[PDB]
Structures are given as C-alpha cells and as structure tokens.
Amino acid sequence: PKELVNEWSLKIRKEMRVVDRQIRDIQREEEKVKRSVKDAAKKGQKDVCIVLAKEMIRSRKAVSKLYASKAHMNSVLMGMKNQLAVLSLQKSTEVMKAMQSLVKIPEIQATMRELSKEMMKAGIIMEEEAEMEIDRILFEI
C-alpha cells in the first residue's frame, strides 16, 4: 500500500494548513484583545480587564493546543515517510499514539478518525492559581 501513503500524507498535510490558519486567526485576535485590555486599564475598568484577560489565557491555551497538534501531525507525517522504507505495512506504534491524540481537535477532529480507520485496516494502528496568570498578563501588557 504505497498508494495510500501519498494520499494520506496530502490529507494530513492539508489539515496542517487548517491548523496554521486557525492559529493565524487566534493570534490576529490577540493583537486586538491586547489593545482593549490597555484601553480598559487606562480608563480604570478593572472588570473589563480581568475578563479580557481570561479571554487571553483562553487564547494562549487554544493556540498551544494547536501547535501541539501540528507536532502530532508531523510525527504522523514522519511515520508516513518511514512507511515508504519499511519493505508492505508495519504497525508503526508511533503513528498509532499520535493519531490517538489527534482525533480530539475540533477542526481536524472529524477527518483524523477516518484516517485512523484507513490505517488501522491492513497496516499501522489545581488551576486555582490560574487566578494568578491573568494578574500576570495584565502586568505583562
């Protein structure tokens, strides 16, 4: 199954773009929240700042989880590079676990699980102090 790899690669790579895109937006959005946060600071609106702040943390986590996804994707792409050399299809216990952590990202969430079948077939398988992070970013901006 050399034919499969080439397509899968492409699919995987295509989701990678979605991932870059989604990040590009979240960041474009943080540019803005940053400004608001400042404005609200200058006008002494504490509650607007705290709130927007939670918006910011939420973003950072969002983006991070995304870059983590990009990694997982590359692990899987690598596994594809490999599958080419492994004289057939061997059960790369690597591209197993990555594609198990990948079927849990909203946007790529759907497809992945379907690629996971195509593969599994005849081949491979207290944040209570996060009330301190906000107070941090406020300061950090």
Q: Where are the domains of the chain?
A: 1-141
40 touches 52 (CB < 8 A): yes
For residue 91, what are the CA distances in angstroms to 57, 116, 120, 124, 140? 39, 12, 8, 4, 47
Hey, what amino acid is at 59? S
102 touches 58 (CB < 8 A): no
CA-angle at 82, arms to 121 and 100, nearest 5°: 50
- The burial class, CB within 10 Å (0-12 / 13-18 / 19+), for 47 is exposed
What is the length of the chain? 141
For residue 97, what are the CA distances in angstroms to 45, 92, 112, 123, 137? 46, 9, 12, 14, 34
Query: How many beta carbons lie within 10 A of that of residue 94, not counting itself?
Result: 15
Sole residue written with tokens 């590079």: 81
- Give the determination technique: X-ray
37 touches 53 (CB < 8 A): yes
74 touches 95 (CB < 8 A): no
